[PDB]
Amino acid sequence: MYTAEQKARIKWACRRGMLELDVVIMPFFEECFDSLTESEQDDFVALLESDDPDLFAWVMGHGRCENLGLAAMVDKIVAHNLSKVRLEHHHHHH
């Protein structure tokens, strides 16, 4: 299940012009990988070759994602972020 080779593809893809996305993927994958199955990971890696405009809006709480396969892993990401927000809040907006 999965390869370090595949992980390298992720490393190149998370690198956007905004650090917020890269920082919630690079070390988060280390943790979330334990909770992510190949089926989830496939759809995740499929996304990584593009950007996440609508998905970014899910993080801001105003997005649209019809394929809940994508939204599923986003929800799993958000759940981890929520504890940061409740702890010492966040920096981006509010």
Orientation angle between helical segments 4-14 and 38-48, nearest 10 degrees: 40
Structure determined via: NMR
CATH code: domain of residue 36: 1.10.150.250
CB–CB of 36/44 below 8 Å?
yes
CB–CB of 35/80 below 8 Å?
no
In whole angstroms, give the CA distance from residue 40 to residue 45.
Answer: 9
Count of structural domains within the chain? 1
Q: Which range of residues forms the domain containing residue 39?
A: 1-94
In whole angstroms, give the CA distance from residue 59 to residue 74.
Answer: 8
CB–CB of 2/38 below 8 Å?
yes
Q: What is the chain's Cα-based Rg?
A: 13
Orientation angle between helical segments 38-48 and 68-88, nearest 10 degrees: 90
In whole angstroms, give the CA distance from residue 20 to residue 87.
Answer: 18
CB–CB of 21/14 below 8 Å?
yes
